Amino acid sequence: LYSEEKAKLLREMMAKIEDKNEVLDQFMDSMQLDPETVDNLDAYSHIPPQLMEKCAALSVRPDTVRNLVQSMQVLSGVFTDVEASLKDIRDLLEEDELLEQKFQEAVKAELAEVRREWAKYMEVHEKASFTNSELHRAMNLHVGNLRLLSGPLDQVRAALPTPALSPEDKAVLQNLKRILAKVQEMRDQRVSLEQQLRELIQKDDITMKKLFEEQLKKYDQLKVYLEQNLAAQDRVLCALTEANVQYAAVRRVLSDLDQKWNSTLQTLVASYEAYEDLMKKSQEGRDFYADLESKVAALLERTQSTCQAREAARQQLL
């Protein structure tokens, strides 16, 4: 009979709180602003734990970059050596063709096999070259980062981009977080006063009927506090929207800085995680081209021997 009056008072107050909260949420969500402001600033200067983990892990095996680069050195040397031997085989064969035509104007089997093997190894080198150039491209892609993670930490941190906000921008941000703090305080106060109202309503058990006009007076104070809370919103929203206007540009800046930070970090992680593959593919190249160099050097020997034997067999001229 009297709980219905309290339920009415509570209903009115909850209607007001719900409307105001609704508009507030529309503005706040429309501004992409949250009391957990995405200004970070602190984050930009702190090396990510996972990165420092990777650095410390590289400090236990300091022959990473060294062994990789040296492997690529050997590989390159064998590469150009193979090219040189192939060229020498070609030259010897063309000289033999010349001498054979001269001899034949004024007057085998092994030679054909040699020529075929030469074309064969020329093609093998041709196809492997793509693999090799891909390996060099990966080397360029990752070696610098692998060398950065293997060095001092201050350089790893130096690689990360940092803000350079003018003092004006700093003031703008501080004002924005001040107003956002006021909004948060206002919301916490709103929920707190709500719970105080519910608590006093629930425990208010009473025992002509004008007594209601007297016993409902115990809510007048909480109603004053709540009206003050709800009526202060429009102004703090005006201030917050003005500050946000002054904040759009710094938002742009710090957003681009965020994405650059993340891209840098991701590239460094990618290089660290690619090292192993780099090493195994470099070892594969070294094996492939050590064997190929072996076969091409043997072919060169047999070419010299066969062309010398042909030029010697041209003794009919004696």
Numbering used by the authors: 11 to 117, 128 to 227, 238 to 348
Wording from the paper:
HD-PTP (His domain protein tyrosine phosphatase; PTPN23) is a non-receptor tumor suppressor phosphatase (Kok et al., 1997, Toyooka et al., 2000) that regulates several ubiquitin-dependent endosomal trafficking processes such as downregulation of EGFR and PDGFRβ signaling (Doyotte et al., 2008, Ma et al., 2015), recycling of Src (Chen et al., 2012, Lin et al., 2011), and degradation of α5β1 integrin (Kharitidi et al., 2015). HD-PTP drives the degradation of mitogenic receptors by coordinating their sorting into the multivesicular body (MVB) via specific recruitment of different endosomal sorting complexes required for transport (ESCRTs) (Ali et al., 2013, Stefani et al., 2011). HD-PTP has a multidomain organization that allows coordinated binding to several ESCRTs. The CC domain of HD-PTP is solely responsible for the interaction with UBAP1, and residue F678 in this domain is essential for binding (Stefani et al., 2011).
